[PDB]
Amino acid sequence: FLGFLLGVGSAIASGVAVCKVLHLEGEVNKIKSALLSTNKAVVSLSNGVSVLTFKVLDLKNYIDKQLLPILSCSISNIETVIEFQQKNNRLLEITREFSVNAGVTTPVSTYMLTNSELLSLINDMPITNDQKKLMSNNVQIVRQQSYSIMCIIKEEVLAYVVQLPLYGVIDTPCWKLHTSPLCTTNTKEGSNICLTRTDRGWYCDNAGSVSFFPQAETCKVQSNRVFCDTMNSLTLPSEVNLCNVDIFNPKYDCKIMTSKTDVSSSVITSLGAIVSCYGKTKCTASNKNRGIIKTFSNGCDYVSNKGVDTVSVGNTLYYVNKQEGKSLYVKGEPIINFYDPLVFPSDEFDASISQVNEKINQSLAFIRKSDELLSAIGGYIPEAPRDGQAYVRKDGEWVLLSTF
Amino acid sequence: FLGFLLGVGSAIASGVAVCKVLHLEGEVNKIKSALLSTNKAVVSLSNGVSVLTFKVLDLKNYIDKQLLPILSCSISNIETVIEFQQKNNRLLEITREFSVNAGVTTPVSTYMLTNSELLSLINDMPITNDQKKLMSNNVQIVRQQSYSIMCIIKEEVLAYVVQLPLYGVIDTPCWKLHTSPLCTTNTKEGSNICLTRTDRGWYCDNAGSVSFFPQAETCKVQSNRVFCDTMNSLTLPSEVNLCNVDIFNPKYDCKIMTSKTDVSSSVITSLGAIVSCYGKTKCTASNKNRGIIKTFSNGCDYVSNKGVDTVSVGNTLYYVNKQEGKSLYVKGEPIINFYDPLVFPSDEFDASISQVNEKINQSLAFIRKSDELLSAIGGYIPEAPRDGQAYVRKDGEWVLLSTF
């Protein structure tokens, strides 16, 4: 939701930097001389940065040795033809993937780097055993968080950079926040007011603060492990967590979004389902054996996945996640009832609890002070007749001096 | 536009539930024993849910029977090598697609499920004949709406769930609503005000209500058939359609969006093109044989595709769709002319017609109360200085009590 609050970064900037270093003279020969003996080595470039180096395919030692002497010529066996095809197919597929993705591909395909080669690279990376273990057990995630930048093809050697991820934060507690509109449940149309928490997404403890990811679609989840990317994050204070237990806390101004659009929807959570059933919409929660087990009343309610298989809102049928865990229902008055609908700002996106309360303080000023000037319309007096003698104010008119 | 009004759902939740059922002990043996005779069968799991089961590739009865006895060892036929390669290539490509997409792929590829096997599953699915017909003629769309979750590879068998779509609503009338900014056409720069309908997207009749899809890019079209997904939809009453014929109807409060950004644009519709030409922008409509046939005046206008091939707005060139059909132009006064620019709220997202009327009634309240009260009031009467003497009003002045 709050994805616009994020910064803008260059993903392949590091790999491209190493790429521009590889264009320099002699830089490629250092690698070719380092891998002249073994297939894997560690090489320090001109600028001192040390990078891993790997030789995955040697068509030179195949075409120049096993294929060249035959090339008047004649082929004697057919097995060498299929052997050459098997050797060349990898280069062909890599060429295809690059020629489509303009030289930068992501995720890293198996043609670009097989599982054996990827696990070898992880084994020799200058990181901890915990990091090697994490990257080795989740190679599918490492492939999805890596790039493949094609660099140069000089001096009978081909070169491309594999930009691998570094997991500097591991095993700290995380939690995912789900939100849904909280509207009133009046009968008249458009008379309802709505309010929605906007701080939804992933939160993880990191360096005495919290890393917030507003677009949870970009965070990949495997088992109870959450692989997020700090590039799509916000560094918030720890007090953000207070918004869950006390949205009216003074130490942090919780972000909301106000409107008048009372439409029904549902948000499938990790262990259940939130259902916002407004209007004449019919919302139910059902089990695969007996059927409907709850018909939601108008409002925002919750249903755990313990014994529930589907949740239907209107014409939409959601399957809830059947993950094992304990769901706790915390009672509470819906805060939308604490508000007066006559001074409720209905056009608020990038809002907060205090920002809306201050916009209410102004409207209370505008109506209780300035509009009540209507009371001073009939409450004041007109000019008495500009006649001979004097007039006194009796009843609602100027009635002279007979009374004298 | 209104995509934020949608809920959040889990797509593979059903397939993942069935997958977690397959992790249980003995379930794999039930599946392995059911397919011992035929290649496809129907199996009811422990929880009673009945699912179709398919064995698409049998490498067991090839490696152990046709390949094992040859492995002193020596291969006699060379054709058997290529035969094994043709049999194994499918497993290799399935492995690639899974290892890249982290175990969940969409659309379902031909390696994952060939056309014959997919039509077999559709033919043996327990649904109506009309659903079989629909899914059989549009396998490309069914693939685009299906998932492939890799489950387990236990006890000499490979298993993955293919999550296929069920089209429970077929052949009901649908319609696509296109919108474009409707601004004034003043000559001054910042004096213009703009208004745009947000109800753009797909609408379909369903169960006495309307399924609304705000992100029409996700709905796929083949011929006059529209394959949408209820997951990203909204259940609206039928009265929403009134917004097309009567934007000021009382039974539904139509959603709009106000601004002051009068920029020129064009919206290519199904049978024509809407052109909003504001400012000094030059917008034309041209035919490939004759050339320019219309120079748009400042405002929002329409052009049918009957005889028109391209429409240019500024430096942007649009090709109109050449589908056969009748386009009808309904004249009418642009509603933006019904508004006063001095009381027109310009900062408005997620608004409605009555929501604009409420702020306009409020602004007129402060104006009709301020200028009509201050002027009628302005000519009141001051008081005589408080000097312990009572004054009476004569000749527009305060004279002290002069009686004896």
Epitope: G272, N287, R290, K294, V303 | -
Partner: antibody, heavy 127, light 108 residues
Framework: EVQLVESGGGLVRPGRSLRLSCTVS????????MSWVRQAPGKGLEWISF??????????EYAASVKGRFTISRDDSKNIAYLQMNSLKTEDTAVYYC??????????????????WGQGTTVTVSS | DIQMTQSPSSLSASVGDRVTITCRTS??????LAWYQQKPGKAPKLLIF???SLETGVPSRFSGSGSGTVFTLTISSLQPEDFAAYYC?????????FGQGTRLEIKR
């Protein structure tokens, strides 16, 4: 944290009355529904009574063996649930457990099992 | 009322064996069963709810299956802690009647 403690058991003459009381501590008592299940000495489990949440009408459902004789009630102000046993027979000598019925979701009038169980209190009905 | 029938009433088995208790109901309970484990003197413990759903904290050796009328509780690998009594309970409508129970003894 979650605890159910039943009290009020003991000796009682055949034909009189005795009130069992289950104290709940650890979760919201008003939102949940309570049940009474007894086990006779040497015999199996027998489901006795059930009272639904305040949200669902406070509906008391009894078993055929104790219908008209037993009466279930709840006092949500102090988180306690009573089982009034009137016109007691000698067969009512048993261990009485207090349980909490678990709704098919977080909150639903369809229940799938008995989540929490008290340790039970022994009631002996003999002259 | 709905009649419950647990079979068998006694089961003799050794440690590490695979055992299966059956619960027959009189009607189609629409998968509204429950399995409880009661050790002698102590309160029963809910193991499986709905038909096969496993309660939190229950080992993987406990399996629930069956549908409609016949339901089975299965212990894959028996452990010395699993020797107790087992009851099935219906949750379709009131009364939520219990089963007779199944006594589990050690084979000797």
């Amino acid at each position: 944290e979650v605890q159910l403690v039943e009290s009020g058991g003991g000796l009682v003459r055949p034909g009189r009355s005795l009130r069992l009381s289950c104290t709940v501590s650890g979760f919201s008592f008003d939102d949940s529904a309570m049940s009474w299940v007894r086990q006779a000495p040497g015999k199996g489990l027998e489901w006795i009574s059930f009272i639904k949440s305040k949200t669902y009408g406070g509906t008391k459902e009894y078993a055929a063996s104790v219908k008209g004789r037993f009466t279930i009630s709840r006092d949500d102000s102090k988180n306690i649930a009573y089982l009034q046993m009137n016109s007691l027979k000698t067969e009512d000598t048993a261990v009485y457990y207090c349980t909490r019925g678990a709704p098919y979701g977080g909150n639903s009038d369809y229940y799938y099992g008995l989540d929490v169980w008290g340790q039970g209190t022994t009631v002996t009905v003999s002259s | 009322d709905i009649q419950m029938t647990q079979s068998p009433s006694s089961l003799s088995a050794s440690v590490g064996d695979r055992v299966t208790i059956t619960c027959r109901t009189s009607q189609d309970v629409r998968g509204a069963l429950a399995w409880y484990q009661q050790k002698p003197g102590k309160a029963p413990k809910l193991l499986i709810f709905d038909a096969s759903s496993l309660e939190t904290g229950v080992p993987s050796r406990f399996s629930g299956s069956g549908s409609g009328t016949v339901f089975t509780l299965t212990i894959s690998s028996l452990q010395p802690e699993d020797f107790a009594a087992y009851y099935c309970q219906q949750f379709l409508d009131f009364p939520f009647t219990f089963g007779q129970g199944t006594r589990l003894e050690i084979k000797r």
